C-alpha cells in the first residue's frame, strides 16, 4: 500500500512544517500581555521554537487571546479573527479569558472567549506563568502532530 | 413655468405618491391631520417629504404651523 505510505509520509512532512515555526500574533489586552512579553524575555525563549512575535494579523498562524474580553472589545476581536487565513489555531490564555474568571459576575464582560471564537488550548493562571504558557504551546504543537487531515482526504 | 397651479399639481401627485393616505381627497380646506386621521408624526413626514421633493429646507416652527395641504402650497408660494 505505497499510496497510503506516501500519504502518511507526506502528511507527516506537511504537519511538521506547520508545527515547526508557528509565528503568532499577540492580541494581549491586560497584564497577561505583560506575561506574554515575559515569555518573550531573554530567559524563556521563543526563537528556539521558530516562534516569532509579530503584530501582523494577515499572516497569523496561531492567536493568543489574553487579557480580559469585554462587550466593547468583542466585535473588534472577531473582526481581527476574520481577516486571518483559515488554517488557524487559538490559545486562550488567562483566567479572565478562558471562562470569565475574576470578572465573571459582572456587566460589560463576555464570560470567557469561548462565546466569540473557538478555543484549541486553554491555559489557566493569573497570570499563567511564562513557563506554563510555553508548556501550553508545546501541547498545542502535539495537537498539531495529531491532525490526520491528509489521511482523511485520501480515504475520503 | 413656476406658477401656483403647477406647484399645486406636483404637490397633488406627491400626495398621491404617499402611501398611508387613503384616499388622497384633496381640498383647499382638507386638514388631513384630524379630518383624515393622521399623526403629527405623519405631519412631519409629509413636511420633510415636500422638502425632499422640490427645494428649501422648511425649518421646525414653519413645519409646525402648516397642518393643512393648501396652507403648505401657500407657504411654498410665499417662500419659493
Amino acid at each position: 500500500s505505497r499510496g497510503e505510505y506516501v500519504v502518511a509520509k507526506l502528511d507527516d512532512l506537511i504537519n511538521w512544517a506547520r508545527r515547526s515555526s508557528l509565528w503568532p500574533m499577540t492580541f494581549g489586552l491586560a497584564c497577561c500581555a505583560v506575561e506574554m512579553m515575559h515569555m518573550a524575555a531573554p530567559r524563556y525563549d521563543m526563537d528556539r521554537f521558530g516562534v516569532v512575535f509579530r503584530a501582523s494579523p494577515r499572516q497569523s498562524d496561531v492567536m493568543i487571546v489574553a487579557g480580559t474580553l469585554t462587550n466593547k472589545m468583542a466585535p473588534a476581536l472577531r473582526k481581527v479573527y476574520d481577516q486571518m487565513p483559515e488554517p488557524r489555531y487559538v490559545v486562550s490564555m488567562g483566567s479572565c479569558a478562558n471562562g470569565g474568571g475574576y470578572y465573571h459576575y459582572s456587566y460589560s464582560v463576555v464570560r470567557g472567549c469561548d462565546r466569540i471564537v473557538p478555543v484549541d488550548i486553554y491555559v489557566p493562571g493569573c497570570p499563567p506563568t511564562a513557563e506554563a504558557l510555553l508548556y501550553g504551546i508545546l501541547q498545542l504543537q502535539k495537537k498539531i502532530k495529531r491532525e490526520k487531515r491528509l489521511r482523511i482526504w485520501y480515504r475520503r | 413655468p413656476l406658477t401656483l397651479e403647477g406647484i399645486k399639481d406636483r404637490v397633488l401627485y406627491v400626495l398621491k405618491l404617499y402611501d398611508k393616505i387613503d384616499p388622497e381627497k384633496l381640498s383647499v380646506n382638507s386638514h388631513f391631520m384630524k379630518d383624515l386621521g393622521l399623526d403629527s408624526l405623519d405631519q412631519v413626514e409629509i413636511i420633510m417629504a415636500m422638502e425632499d421633493e422640490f427645494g428649501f429646507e422648511i425649518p421646525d416652527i414653519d413645519a409646525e404651523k402648516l397642518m393643512c395641504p393648501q396652507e403648505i402650497v401657500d407657504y411654498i408660494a410665499d417662500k419659493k
Binding site: 471562562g99 469561548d114 462565546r115 466569540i116 471564537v117 473557538p118 478555543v119 484549541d120 491532525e147 490526520k148 487531515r149 482523511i152 480515504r155 475520503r156 | -
Partner: protein, 287 residues
C-alpha cells in the same frame, strides 16, 4: 421520562430545554445551522464526526459550556453508531456527497447508511427520528442521486414507519451550492420553473417540528414563495451581483409541488422571500 430532560425556565445558553439530539452529519451546511438553532434553544447535541477535529472545532463554540459533545462514527460498523445512539431523545439523519467518491457511490450511502442506523435506532428505542430527503426524488430517470434517495425514502418509510421524512426544496443561503455555481460561471441557457426556499425558514421548521409533538408520521415538503423561471432567476442574480454536469442536470430536472403532503402552513413560521435574503447574501462582487 427522567428529570433533566424536562424543560427548565427560559431559553438559551444552558437553560435546560427538552430534546437531546443525536445528529448525523452537522459538519455540512444545514446540520450546522440546525445545531446553531438548537444552541439558541439550549439543547444538548451529541454529534459524531469522521473527519479532522478542526472542522468540528470551528463549529465547536456554538453551544454553551460543555453542552454539545463530539464523538466518532463510521459508515461500516454498528458498534460505533450504536454507541453514539445509546442514550438519545431524538435523532436526525442528514448525509450525502453530491459526487461519487472512490469508496462511496450515490448508492449505499443513501441506501446502506439509513439501514444500519435505523436498525440500531429501532433496537435502541429512539423517538422523533427526522430523515431528510431531496425534493422529488423518484424511481424515474436522470439521477443515481435521486433514485438512491427514493430507495432510501422507501426504506425509512418501511422500517421505523413513524419517522418524519422531511424534504425542503433546493435551499439557498450563505453557503449555497447552486447560487455559488451561478457565481462560478463560465455559458448556457435553458428553461425550468423553480421555487427557491431560504435556509433559515427550513431549519426553523425542522426545530419547531422536532420540539412540537403530535406532528409525527407525516412527510413534509417546503415551498419556495416565488416559483418562477430559472433563467429569469439567473438574470436576477447577475443583475444584483453587478457583473454581466450532475449539478446542472439536477437543477434542470424537476421542480414541482405535491398536493399530497403538508408544508409550511401546518407549522406556523413566516416565509422569507428570495429577494430580501438574496440582496443580503449577494456580497463579494466588484466593490
Amino acid at each position: 421520562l427522567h428529570h433533566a430532560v424536562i424543560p427548565h425556565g427560559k431559553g438559551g445558553r444552558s437553560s435546560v430545554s427538552g430534546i437531546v439530539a443525536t445528529v448525523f452529519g452537522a459538519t455540512g451546511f444545514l446540520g450546522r445551522y440546525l445545531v446553531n438553532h438548537l444552541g439558541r434553544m439550549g439543547s444538548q447535541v451529541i454529534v459524531p464526526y469522521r473527519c479532522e477535529p478542526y472542522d468540528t472545532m470551528h463549529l465547536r463554540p456554538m453551544g454553551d459550556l460543555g453542552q454539545i459533545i463530539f464523538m466518532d462514527w463510521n459508515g461500516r460498523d454498528k458498534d460505533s453508531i450504536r454507541r453514539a445512539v445509546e442514550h438519545s431523545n431524538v435523532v436526525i439523519n442528514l448525509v450525502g456527497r453530491e459526487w461519487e467518491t472512490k469508496n462511496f457511490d450515490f448508492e449505499d450511502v443513501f441506501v446502506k447508511i439509513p439501514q444500519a442506523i435505523a436498525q440500531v435506532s429501532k433496537e435502541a428505542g429512539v423517538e422523533k427520528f427526522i430523515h431528510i430527503s431531496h425534493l422529488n426524488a423518484d424511481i424515474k430517470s436522470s439521477s443515481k442521486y435521486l433514485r438512491n434517495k427514493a430507495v432510501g425514502e422507501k426504506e425509512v418509510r418501511e422500517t421505523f414507519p413513524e419517522a418524519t421524512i422531511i424534504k425542503p426544496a433546493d435551499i439557498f443561503g450563505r453557503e449555497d451550492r447552486f447560487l455559488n455555481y451561478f457565481a462560478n460561471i463560465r455559458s448556457l441557457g435553458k428553461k425550468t420553473v423553480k421555487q427557491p426556499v431560504y435556509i433559515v425558514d427550513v431549519t426553523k421548521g425542522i426545530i419547531n417540528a422536532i420540539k412540537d409533538p403530535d406532528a409525527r408520521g407525516k412527510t413534509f415538503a417546503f415551498v419556495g414563495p416565488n416559483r418562477y423561471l430559472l433563467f429569469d432567476l439567473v438574470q436576477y442574480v447577475f443583475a444584483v451581483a453587478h457583473r454581466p454536469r450532475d449539478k446542472v442536470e439536477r437543477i434542470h430536472t424537476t421542480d414541482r409541488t405535491l398536493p399530497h403532503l403538508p408544508g409550511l402552513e401546518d407549522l406556523g413560521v413566516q416565509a422569507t422571500p428570495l429577494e430580501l435574503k438574496a440582496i443580503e447574501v449577494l456580497r463579494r462582487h466588484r466593490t
